[PDB]
Amino acid sequence: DLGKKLLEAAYYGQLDEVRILMANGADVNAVDVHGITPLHLAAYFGHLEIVEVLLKTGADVNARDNRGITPLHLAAAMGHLEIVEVLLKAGADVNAFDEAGDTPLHLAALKGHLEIVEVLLKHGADVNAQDKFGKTAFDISIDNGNEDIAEVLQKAAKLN
């Protein structure tokens, strides 16, 4: 019951309740039948303070759901730069591959987030990683017409 309440607290930005539930023994690594953890939900919905509290209390920064999606994948796709930075500082795998072969860099390129792309690159994101469709992050930025992101990915590749 505490784990379900913790998932819901993360979903709805219930920071104070997150603290209370974990003081009362809730598993910070509670996981639903889809593989989704409180940290995934806080990352997806942009709840930065909840991300921080969960990490402080032992959340697995690299939890994969049943599709191989990590909290970093979700924060990168949803445009939450500070969360991206916090997750990386806590040891998030910058080049985690989901079941489609997409990395956080692929998703940040897919959703056109320039500074998130840049931070991922500064932390070692792999410009040569291909997803299961043969696409690198650069290919995605070409496909979606984002010239600024394509330029920074091409620069990164040239200087590797």
Partner: peptide, 20 residues
């Protein structure tokens, strides 16, 4: 449904999140 190509695993997780 979810279209086949880049992002499909992300979108599938997003859909599941949307049903919680």
């Amino acid at each position: 449904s979810i279209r086949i190509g880049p992002g499909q695993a992300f979108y599938a997780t997003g859909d599941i999140i949307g049903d919680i």
